[PDB]
Amino acid sequence: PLGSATITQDTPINQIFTDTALAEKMKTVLGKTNVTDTVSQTDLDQVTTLQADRLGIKSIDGVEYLNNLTQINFSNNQLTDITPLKNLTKLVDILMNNNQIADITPLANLTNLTGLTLFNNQITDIDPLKNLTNLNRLELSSNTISDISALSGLTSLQQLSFGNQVTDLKPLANLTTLERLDISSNKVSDISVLAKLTNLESLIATNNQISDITPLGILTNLDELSLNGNQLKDIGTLASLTNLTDLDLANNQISNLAPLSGLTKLTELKLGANQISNISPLAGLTALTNLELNENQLEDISPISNLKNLTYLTLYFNNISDISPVSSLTKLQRLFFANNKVSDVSSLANLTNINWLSAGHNQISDLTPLANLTRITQLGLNDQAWTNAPVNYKANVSIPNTVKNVTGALIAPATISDGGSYTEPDITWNLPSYTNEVSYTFSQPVTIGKGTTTFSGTVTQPLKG
Amino acid sequence: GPLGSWVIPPISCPENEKGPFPKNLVQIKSNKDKEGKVFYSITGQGADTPPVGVFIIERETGWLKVTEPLDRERIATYTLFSHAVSSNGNAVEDPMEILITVTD
CATH class of the missing domain: 2.60.40.1220 (Immunoglobulin-like)
Structure with a gap:
């Protein structure tokens, strides 16, 4: 074929695949006994998939002869140079995370690529991805990318991640097919472009510098949202996101929970490390199984008694004296309330299915009411x-x-x-x-x-x- | 005892997940973080020993993630261990065994 690399004479496997680990893998794939055994181009043309992850491969020299490859997995190796992939135009999916790749120019002419996984590499320059217009999935987190201009024409992308020096999200404007985006651990404050991405179902944006979430207002299809580790206070916009089932707002500066009151599809809600003293707005969120309220300014936790489906609850590092509102939440399996002012734990005898009970740094003087909680496997009562x-x-x-x-x-x-x-x-x-x-x-x-x-x-x- | 100041939610790991990978499972924490910065790591087969890096943890935030789709019928279980150390490399918690079951 034009552009393709082929052997004209039968050649030993170890002379094609010069890397010792890849030669041993190819011997098994090709059904040979030793790495010195010869193979023909017809033999190499039979290989359409290759699962070569976690083999200590430093070079993919020889893979250019596997002209019919459609799917490869070279993840978790020691690859730097990926020049042998340049002319493998039948490739549709590449899994190549966890390598030492910096130069992705050899991927530029792989137009049939619909999936490309390159997270945990040493990539700064993503210009070679600009014409991979058939890409549906692209993962680029744990790299040193600061410029996503190359993503602007990837108008078939449904799943996308990148990192870790991006400030400017403007190149995402026309990527309306996007359903699942992960911009975590970048240098982003301005998410105004996200208002254009109305098909988003999942937005993960942890560990950024975001304070303004008004761009999310019309993203009504969002079922999963994570803004953990930002600078949020005003969460009024969240009232519009009625499809939300999983919401993580931990490690912010939020005090007013009224905007969450009507998000009754919520099953998981993280609000730890905020400035919350009033949980009355959470009273109607009866589908909640997981709730995190640690590191707040809570005293009166009486509204928590409404959350009868809770199996996981954190309340550690608050000013709570009366733990009894958690006592009617009989499905509770893990409860954490260390660093509070609780003395009477007798109501906790009603949590018969409790497995993890963490209550250190309280005012507990008598363990007798906990004697029959024999399903416990993890316990904390120090200090x-x-x-x-x-x-x-x-x-x-x-x-x-x-x-x-x-x-x-x-x-x-x-x-x-x-x-x-x-x-x-x-x-x-x-x-x-x-x-x-x-x-x-x-x-x-x-x-x-x-x-x-x-x-x-x-x-x-x-x-x- | 073994729990100490650990705060770990139960881990649900469905097979054949949708990307982008790595995908967050749960965010682990040690409450020893109030008396100084804590750094998180994970060991076990599926983490530091083969298959290396199926599970990873973000060192500063405690976010335990899965890096690829799992397959029940291939490997059904993984035994990992979470670790918490201070800026001086001292263990602030006893390592916690975490049994991950690959569900439907």
Whole structure:
């Protein structure tokens, strides 16, 4: 064929495919016994697909003779030079992620390409892709691309990703066929061009500098949206996106959740690391199975009782004293509320299917209400802290120890301040003078079901003069 | 104990997924990140040993991703281990076993 590379005489496999790992692969593909065995061009013409991923291949020299190749997979190798692919015009799909490729000029004349995977390479210049107008799928994340002008005429693209230095998205304007876009980990603030991409069903845009989401208003087909790690506050535009089932707004500056109130198709919602104090707008989102509300300003979490389908919930790093609103969410399997002010965990006995329970850095003094949660496999109860009600100071002051293990037995103090001692069930101090407070710590390994932790803490005891 | 300050959602890995790849599965975190920066990594067959890089984790964000379509009837299960270290390379968590099941 014109442009094609062919052998005219029968040649050893190891003289065609000079890379030692590719010669061994081609020996198996071609049904030969040794890499020195000769093959003809007719033999090489039988190869239409090649799954050569994860073989330590440094060179694809010889692949130019496989004229009938339509689909290749050379992902997870050590390729740099891809010049042997230049004239393989029958190629429709190439999987070549996780290599050391910088120069993609050999892909320029592969007009029949509908799929091209090149993520995790060393590509800056994507100009060679500009005339691959039949491409439906193109993955370019984990590269050093800053200029996407070459994408402007790829008007058949349905799935697209790129990275990691892109600021200007203007070249995407005419790519209205786009359904699934991933612009994560770029230098993007201006997503105004995305308003043109009205066929978008999935938009992943994590770890950018986005503060203005008004361009998303008419993208009514969006079912999946991730703006995790941006500069969002005003999410009013989201009320228009009624088809959303999966929404990730973690690591922003959001306080007003009213725009999410009517997005009743939501099953997964991430709102961790924001400025939220009012979750009343979430009350009607009863299809939610996963909800993340960690690292906010929450106290009154009473509206969470409406979310009866929740199996996963995070509330860690808030100002919550009353955990009882989670108690009627009986499908809960993983619950995380470390770094709160919770003392009474008795309502948690109603979460009979709980597997992961993380409650460190609270004010928990008694594990007995959790004794029957035997389906637990992961447990966290370290570093509790609370201050008891004041007791009258006397020179020989005695308080009852109140720290109780899951068995109902008192846990002996690990340390006692001001030279105090322990004779079960009382901690006694004999003080040389009046002091404002005394204290003690505890540290006790414990297992409930198959979940193991250290139940520990610091108890501060005020003494009234 | 083993859970420590880990926060891990359950992982759903359907076979024959749609791109673009890599596709996010879940975002893992250690709450030890409030006392200093945390760096995430993954080990196991399917991660650092063969098949290398089926699963990868973004070191700063904790985003665990799948790099290609999975095939139940080829490999049904993968045992991975998440790791969390500080800026000084010290393990801030005990490594967490993560059993990924390839569903329909």
